[PDB]
Amino acid sequence: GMAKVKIVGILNVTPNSFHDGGRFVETDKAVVRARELLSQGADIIEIGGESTGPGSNTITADEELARIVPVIRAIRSSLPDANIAVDTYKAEVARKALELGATMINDVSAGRADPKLFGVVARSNAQIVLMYSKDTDPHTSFDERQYVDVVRTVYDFLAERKKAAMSAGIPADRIILDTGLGHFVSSDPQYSFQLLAHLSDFQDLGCKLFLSPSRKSFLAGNELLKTADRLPGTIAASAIAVLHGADYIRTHDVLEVRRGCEIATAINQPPER
Amino acid sequence: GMAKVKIVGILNVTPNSFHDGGRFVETDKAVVRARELLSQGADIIEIGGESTGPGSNTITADEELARIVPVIRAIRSSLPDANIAVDTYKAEVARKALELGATMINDVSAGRADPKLFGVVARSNAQIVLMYSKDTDPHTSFDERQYVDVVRTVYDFLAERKKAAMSAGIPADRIILDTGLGHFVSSDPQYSFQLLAHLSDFQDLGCKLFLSPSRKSFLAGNELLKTADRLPGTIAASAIAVLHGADYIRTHDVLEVRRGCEIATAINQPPER
Numbered sequence: 001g002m003a004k005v006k007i008v009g010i011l012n013v014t015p016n017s018f019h020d021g022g023r024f025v026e027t028d029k030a031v032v033r034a035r036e037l038l039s040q041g042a043d044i045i046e047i048g049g050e051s052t053g054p055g056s057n058t059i060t061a062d063e064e065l066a067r068i069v070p071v072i073r074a075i076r077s078s079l080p081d082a083n084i085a086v087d088t089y090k091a092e093v094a095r096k097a098l099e100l101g102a103t104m105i106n107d108v109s110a111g112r113a114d115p116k117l118f119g120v121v122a123r124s125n126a127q128i129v130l131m132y133s134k135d136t137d138p139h140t141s142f143d144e145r146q147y148v149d150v151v152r153t154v155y156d157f158l159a160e161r162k163k164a165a166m167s168a169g170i171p172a173d174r175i176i177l178d179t180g181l182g183h184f185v186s187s188d189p190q191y192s193f194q195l196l197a198h199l200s201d202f203q204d205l206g207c208k209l210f211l212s213p214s215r216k217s218f219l220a221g222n223e224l225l226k227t228a229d230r231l232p233g234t235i236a237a238s239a240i241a242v243l244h245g246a247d248y249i250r251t252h253d254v255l256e257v258r259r260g261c262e263i264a265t266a267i268n269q270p271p272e273r
Numbered sequence: 274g275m276a277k278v279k280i281v282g283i284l285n286v287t288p289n290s291f292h293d294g295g296r297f298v299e300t301d302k303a304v305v306r307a308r309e310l311l312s313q314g315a316d317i318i319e320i321g322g323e324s325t326g327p328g329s330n331t332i333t334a335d336e337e338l339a340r341i342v343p344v345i346r347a348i349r350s351s352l353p354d355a356n357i358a359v360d361t362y363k364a365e366v367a368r369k370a371l372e373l374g375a376t377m378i379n380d381v382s383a384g385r386a387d388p389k390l391f392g393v394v395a396r397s398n399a400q401i402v403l404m405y406s407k408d409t410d411p412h413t414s415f416d417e418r419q420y421v422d423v424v425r426t427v428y429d430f431l432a433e434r435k436k437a438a439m440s441a442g443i444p445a446d447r448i449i450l451d452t453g454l455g456h457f458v459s460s461d462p463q464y465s466f467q468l469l470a471h472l473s474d475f476q477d478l479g480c481k482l483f484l485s486p487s488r489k490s491f492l493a494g495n496e497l498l499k500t501a502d503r504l505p506g507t508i509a510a511s512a513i514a515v516l517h518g519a520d521y522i523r524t525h526d527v528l529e530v531r532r533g534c535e536i537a538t539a540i541n542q543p544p545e546r
């Protein structure tokens with residue numbers, strides 16, 4: 001029987017008032033959202049303290065740890081079975097995250113931002129998700145980047161990042177590959193669609209596949225739909241991704257995306273003979 | 274550029290009180306639903322007066338025409354551009370439907386229930402949709418029918434129904450094939466999934482493909498979801514169907530299914546070179 005896709009629930013820690021204090025309130029609400037993520041069917045709770053999309057702000061390592069360290073401590077204290085991923089590109093944030101018990105590190109830079117992040121992951125058993133980004137900056141930008149063949153560019157990029165991660169001590173069975181979607185690839189939505197169509201081409205690299213459509217820009221369509229109207233598109237994009245080899249789906253709509261991806265897994269399942 | 278999938282909006286005419294009178298009220302509401310179907314993006318309005326799923330009731334031809342004849346007359350009077358399909362298996366209902374201006378006839382029996390339906394369609398330019406059904410009765414039944422290979426059984430069935438429709442005078446470019454889904458195939462949901470997986474195998478028959486996941490039984494999943502919770506599953510099933518060759522998608526959720534299927538069409542679209 002074909003195994004299910006693992007749903008990665010998103011849990012971003014963004015302070016209400018970015019002044020001093022009031023973080024105890026923000027930690028309490030983050031545990032509430034994490035419990036609802038689990039109750040909707042999420043297999044992994046991805047805690048991140050720094051947004052990396054276009055228009056996002058760069059935050060220091062001290063501020064990043066100030067946001068996620070209380071959250072990880074609270075979740076692993078009351079929900080010790082829940083597997084936790086941490087969305088970070090700093091080696092210092094990853095080190096403290098792995099000490100607390102995080103089992104996965106999502107690096108939007110694919111180890112490029114902090115040269116010491118690869119080794120910190122290697123000295124553990126944590127898995128790492130290398131995502132393709134059109135920019136060296138982990139904070140992607142609004143740019144209608146064009147490609148002669150986006151599939152070859154992303155394939156060759158992830159191939160050399162996997163080699164760089166293996167040379168740092170991370171085995172291939174602990175490396176997860178993310179072709180990137182939306183603005184990370186291009187503000188031209190055609191290239192996110194082409195990557196979804198040829199997702200199975202990346203399985204030759206021998207690593208589990210990680211994708212996050214999650215109401216991104218490329219799901220706007222001809223109607224120029226905004227975020228509130230992208231749920232049908234993100235269900236279809238995530239389902240077709242699972243049909244084309246995606247092992248992880250990172251989304252904000254855990255309940256609906258899991259139920260849609262469950263249909264894709266059932267379509268991929270041959271009969272019981 | 275790859276053409277879009279044509280969304281078929283469902284419009285069932287079921288009397289409120291099945292007594293005498295009050296049909297003028299039911300005709301007025303049916304035009305309202307038809308306008309909303311068009312405004313959500315439906316390309317065809319499918320008007321049917323007889324449900325054919327399990328537990329449905331068999332109605333006479335006089336009653337069937339009593340329900341749909343005022344509806345078709347009202348829609349084609351105020352919305353003369355709207356293309357109209359009629360869900361019927363009776364040659365008499367199809368004849369009156371084609372005279373009023375219907376451009377498509379959806380026959381759940383694939384011409385088996387009324388031997389004269391094929392010829393009535395042939396004396397017109399209307400397209401016909403032949404759907405596979407496990408039962409000779411157009412009203413399908415609750416039955417966990419098993420198959421050695423459901424794909425071969427449905428393929429050979431549609432192949433001989435197409436030959437029977439061509440021998441009756443209907444050209445191949447006016448024949449649309451529906452493998453059937455849900456209870457029409459089997460109350461065992463595995464076979465609807467296997468048909469979706471191998472939908473592209475039916476393109477060898479040389480006809481446009483017609484599918485209607487539309488919150489059927491097989492989308493219940495392990496959670497045993499009921500109809501209200503099947504919208505994510507029906508978006509994923511319809512999108513994967515379009516990815517696998519479906520030219521028509523018949524649904525109740527026109528707005529969401531069209532937006533999800535639009536993502537599938539964009540994934541199927543190769544770059545502009």
Ligand SMILES: Nc1nc2ncc(COP(=O)(O)OP(=O)(O)O)nc2c(=O)[nH]1
Nearest residue numbers: 012051053106129131178181212214216
């Ligand atoms: N591995 C991976 N990580 C990511 N992190 C952030 C975002 C930003 O996308 P978005 O859907 O807007 O999520 P958020 O609202 O948390 O920024 N996308 C990815 C992604 O696509 N892949």
Ligand SMILES: Nc1nc2ncc(COP(=O)(O)OP(=O)(O)O)nc2c(=O)[nH]1
Nearest residue numbers: 285324326379402404451454485487489
């Ligand atoms: N060609 C075709 N015709 C059909 N007519 C009725 C139903 C019944 O399915 P359902 O989703 O329950 O629609 P309704 O609520 O109108 O009965 N399904 C099909 C179908 O799958 N294919």
Ligand SMILES: [Cl-]
Nearest residue numbers: 146147148149
């Ligand atoms: Cl290039």
Ligand SMILES: [Cl-]
Nearest residue numbers: 151152155201
């Ligand atoms: Cl390649």
Ligand SMILES: [Cl-]
Nearest residue numbers: 215216217218
């Ligand atoms: Cl956006």
Ligand SMILES: [Cl-]
Nearest residue numbers: 419420421422
């Ligand atoms: Cl059999």
Ligand SMILES: [Cl-]
Nearest residue numbers: 424425428474
């Ligand atoms: Cl076959």
Ligand SMILES: [Cl-]
Nearest residue numbers: 488489490491
């Ligand atoms: Cl049902």
